[PDB]
Amino acid sequence: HPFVIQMRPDLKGALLSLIEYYQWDKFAYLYDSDRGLSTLQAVLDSAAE
Amino acid sequence: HPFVIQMRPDLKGALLSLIEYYQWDKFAYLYDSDRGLSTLQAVLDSAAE
Hints:
2 chains; mainly alpha; 2 helices; globular; Glutamate receptor 2 (chains A, B)
């Protein structure tokens, strides 16, 4: 989306890399729906691969 | 949300009951964010339970 400038960096890749680093195969992901499920969608998509 | 009259019935229950009827334990759920994440949250919470 154009004309919108977001100061906040994206956390998705960082979290994926952290989970990868800690060598976690199996875990529980708690999530709050008010902030949005986007990152959850990310970790779910990654979960299959 | 008030003042909105929604003709389309809620499909969640039929889905969950159908899954439980076919005796499904493990499966694949493909989804798009076009319609909203509500059904997804339904199958995820019910999967957790």
